[PDB]
Symmetry: C5
Subunit: 348 residues, 5 copies
């Protein structure tokens, strides 16, 4: 007659099989399932999610008579009776664990029990515009159903612990329905571009601008070839660091990688042209690559020195003319390309 006695008798019943008597169709209600994001990986595009759900089903064999047992509820260990397992079929490595060791059972057979599902979903995201990206990820929630025996799952509400999970920010988690009456959660993922814009795009933009203005350095004065090779080996490091953390899979791959490649090529070409111009200024032609008498001798020497200085000036001015032409052309194309690349990366 004790409530503990009722619990013990229910344990001794050993009902470790599901209530499949009614045509092997068990309606399982899961109201108020709470979703949370634990991490997001950008290189692998994999989402770690935690879903705390409240399963509520019916077990007719676990229903006593109220007259003999004057109680309305009883708490039993989870492993001493049957309990459904909830799966994330869409993702890999799904694991369901029990929040508590005890579950409540009412006098009419209703069973309430809270569970936690940790899942890893191979999310597909349109990462073409890094970092200005964001997309919707489906997460399937399913319970076992094979052939004739099918246990429908009825879901009511979803609550999301929305908040940044690192670089990525989870915006919403809504409940939608699939084609074959499959319930799933649509999770909206977005990228906070405040970090990538400052750490990646801004330094490269300033570096390209510095290269554009680097043509002010005179060829003869020096401090120009080293200045540009420093930029080149810095942009190579940038390319390596960018490649270390973005997926170069296939169609709609991130376009920042191609932009870095093109900027590196442009910088290398500019440095090459600068070095060739330096040689032209120094030598005067690009042939390196291709295979009272005492009072008179003094004015002869003086005019010889003057003529030498004049030739030095002329050969230092011709290369300056060529450098000016190339600088105008290069700066125009570089600015137009940078504007086009930004317009593509933000609105395409």
């Amino acid at each position: 007659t004790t409530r503990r006695c009722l619990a013990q008798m229910l344990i001794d019943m050993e009902m470790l099989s599901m209530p499949q008597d009614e045509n092997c169709t068990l309606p399982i209600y899961v109201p108020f399932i709470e979703y949370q994001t634990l991490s997001v990986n950008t290189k692998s595009l994999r989402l770690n999610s935690r879903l705390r759900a409240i399963v509520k089903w019916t077990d007719p064999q676990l229903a006593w008579d109220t007259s003999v047992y004057p109680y309305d509820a009883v708490m039993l260990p989870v492993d001493k009776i049957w309990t459904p397992v909830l799966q994330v079929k869409n993702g890999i490595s799904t694991n369901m664990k029990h929040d508590a060791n005890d579950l409540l059972v009412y006098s009419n057979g209703t069973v309430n029990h809270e569970v936690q599902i940790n899942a890893e979903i191979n999310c597909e995201v349109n990462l073409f515009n890094y970092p200005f990206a964001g997309d919707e990820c489906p997460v399937a929630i399913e319970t076992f159903s094979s052939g004739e025996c099918v246990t429908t799952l009825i879901l009511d509400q979803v609550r999301s612990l929305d908040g940044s999970t690192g670089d990525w920010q989870t915006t919403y988690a809504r409940l939608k329905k699939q084609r074959e009456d499959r319930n799933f959660i649509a999770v909206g993922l977005k990228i906070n571009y405040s970090s990538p814009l400052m750490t990646l795009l801004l330094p490269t933009v300033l570096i390209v601008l510095a290269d554009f203005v680097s043509f002010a350095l005179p060829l003869h004065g020096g401090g120009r070839n080293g200045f540009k090779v420093t930029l080149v080996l810095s942009f190579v490091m940038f390319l390596n660091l960018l490649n270390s953390q973005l997926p170069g899979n296939g169609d709609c791959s991130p376009i920042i990688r191609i932009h870095f490649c093109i900027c590196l090529v442009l910088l290398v070409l500019s440095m090459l042209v600068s070095m060739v111009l330096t040689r032209l200024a120094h030598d005067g032609s690009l042939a390196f690559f291709s295979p009272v008498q005492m009072l008179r001798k003094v004015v002869t020497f003086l005019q010889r020195l003057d003529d030498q200085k004049n030739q030095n000036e002329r050969k230092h001015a011709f290369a300056d003319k060529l450098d000016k032409i190339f600088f105008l052309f290069y700066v125009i194309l570089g600015l137009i390309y940078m504007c086009v690349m930004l317009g593509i990366m933000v609105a395409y």
Copy 2:
């Protein structure tokens, strides 16, 4: 009749259900719960904590008669009877582990048993003033309670193994109460700024000072543009290192990131101005960007050389005047900005 026989009888009773006889309300006492911090993550803002608690509850069915059994205590395996599970509902990934395989039971039904809860809590900390930051983190301690059946938790004292856990230092762990009679522990986390200030803030401040002094280098003499390009590509590396370990989530994001961005922009602007001044000094105008007779001829040559030297001096002096004006302007704005930025980062 032996104590081992009594223990075996209690094992054979198989009371694996909760002592829910008295209206399904079991008061669980947890006096002297010890808290310790294992790690703190600054980027993800996640706290790993270990709580060693001493649960002490009542099991009426596990109470023998003292006259037949002349003993006052008996130790039984934890898995052979019922035991409550303690949870950290506020945080993710909570696991409760049995410290020992045995528990003590008195003759009046009281059961003493110690447990260890390892939990990971998504801590919310105001990280605006990195590294001068510190805040209070709630850690909930809860046990299962559903519907009619509730088992209240009564907590008495908290002891903290206070000590640095890396960059972060745990200051205190007090016991407070929530709204709906929920017991929780408030943990005070603080940042030891001795490490971040030396490794991060001091080198950047000294580099900025070196940039402010860098204008002393003569434009014609060289060694100025490469000197600043080294600083710029070092500050880019500093920005990357800062972005690697700080959360750029949203409002009240760390201000050191914006400070590094602004310092980098100022350095790049100083470089551009210096390079333009170098071109102006070399060429004389910013048009590169914009599209007895023997005894007399020697005097002509000498005065021509003297005039050329005078022109060289004048073009090297005009750029010096412009550089001085820009240096005064830039140094005043830089000092005022650095003072304002430190004032913001310290007391805002």
Copy 3:
């Protein structure tokens, strides 16, 4: 008479041994096995795979009479009866995991049950042409069979969730057969060379081309020896980065490592000869390594100055001639070597 009663009776049968009555030969059918790649490691050449299979076998003892029990199916817990374990013998660390806690059993003894095998396979791949590489990996699927008792496994179809797993791309998963009637899955792995070509090959090619054009810098003008030492010390970093992520095992090791080594050696040789040429130009020979009168005196001084300048010019032109000869030789040899190495790395 209840279906739950039938399930309980089958549970109480306790049939935890395999149906080996028929000559200890159990045919196990596994139709529609789905293969997916989780990760591929290039340095260790290890493949992580997940195989979701649908096992379907026969258990004669688990077959009831339809007249007494008017049902066609029943779902029982997986651990209450015997279930085969599927292994990946070819690879290491194979683990079979239960998809659900229930399995369906028909009235004639047929049992349907889904399993998930996670395996890690030591894959052998011809990585000579990094990154233009691709190969077929065998994955064995087997069940326990010792001596007289054998359980043949009959497979029907394989479905692959083809898609990039990082750097590597899985193309197909077909079903083939081994010699001794062993069923296995051939998985086609390919490398997306878009990432390695941009991050590794292109910067090195551009750096090498820059080294070839660096000979334009005059010996006296400076900015040349440092320009080359930066390239050499950057190529050392490239060699380290390349070594950090590629298996240098033995025969048919990646040839990009040898190519990087040879390019570094060539750059070092070019720098050495350039520095020797600089010394020759400065000193005039490679011996450092080897152990009216007033109106006339001015003419003498002017002639001495002119002769000194003439000697400087001649000693600066001889080294220019030597540098031109070496530049022609070096450029021709380096271009032919680069073309040959690319031809080897692409189509050999």
Copy 4:
């Protein structure tokens, strides 16, 4: 009458409670416990240890009669009887694991069984003098004891597998007793200073010596400010590397961090002074920061050039003298500081 029959009957007795008949006091003997260190973490100051112990206790219920059963020993599974669990109360994450599945039981009740305890101990070591450091770490060995029931643990001998565990070297492991009759193991940890010395201290000392010598570089000749900026940025990198792997907790924090900070400050000050001196030499004053006639005119020009050359020589010599005075003072201070810091780091 079979030994296997005796083992089966002992198993069937189901003695899963501890031998608490004798006043609930069980003397547990653990002779010849072997200690080994698996790893030491310098940043977190956490010790990973493995202890292979040989527990030997008494179980009166597991004692048969020799006349009926003519045997002296029997081996039983560990899980079929009671076995004590050994804990490391001082440290976190203590786990006890059975070395074998079987244990030996004698005819008089004595039970021999070997166990392995893996523990993580939060070690407190005086790391002020990195790397010349070393200290004694206590490791508690304890078994469950609550209230009236206590089971004392009697230890005899400790043997340690001495050998370097990375940077740290374990020297000894002795057995001592605490205040409240608690047995513990004192482990002597020491740092092999050869690796940290050669990788951190010697390069920094050599860099500081190079900085002290760098004053020989002439102000006008160039190649000086780039040298010092390379030194300073390399020292900042060293500061970052040092901060990445040393605990900056509080009092008696490693003093190498302060030494690196002070040396960096000194280098920056030397750079600033050198740049200001260079400007003074170039300009002549620190005001940039503060807001027959033909035969005669040639003599005028020549004396003007001579005067200008003399002024250039004087303004170079004044800066040379100032640089000499600063060099003397700076080198004296630097040598005295380096010697004092070495003395503090080695013998304080």
Copy 5:
């Protein structure tokens, strides 16, 4: 009479104790044990191994009568009877895993069953000659044996899956015997020096050669001190990277560390002497460290300029002589040291 009925009766026998009837001495035969290496760590010198063994023992109680049961073999679950646990006593963290959930038992009591042992062995390797190193590692295979009860292990053959495991290459795995009749496996580990020689030794060799040839750069011309300081801060990075992956334990520590230290010291000394020679050339003495009239005056100025240029030439030649003497010393000493160190690192 059914084979399944025979298996069920064997399961119901519940023989979970070792077959210890015959003097508690059980001969366990393990023929054809296969060894494989999973990973080798160079810094910690720890070997990860997988051993797939085929245990074959005798269980007299698990033997039926052939006349009543006309069968020769039967398959039983591994957990329903006794099974030995194979251990790796020499190494840490040994785990034995069941290859299958079933085992075969013959009519005469013989039991065949394969197991998998994963072990981690603290290997002792003579790493003095890195990378030209290689040594033999013992791996113990043992079963539980305490006091009177001893289970001998009889091993027949070992087959090894030879193949590179990263940097390390496993050559052989033979079976030997210890002193006290203990069976163990000797595994031959060797280092593929193709990777370390290319990534570590060769770049340092060319860097050293570049330092030796760097003396060609003239003192006055510049581009020398920066060239050497770049090499010095590159060699410091090499020292750090080498220290990151090699064990500096004690006697017979790798000599490449000492070699890198000595090369760095030599480079620093060469840089220091070059920087001193620069000042000697510029100033003329090492005292910085130590505390018709018109037609005639023009001749006076001209001869003064000539004398000044003559003094410049003489002071630029004396330092050249000193530099030549030092270079003749230094190149010979360094070449002899490099040859001696290579001879030591190869054949000592």
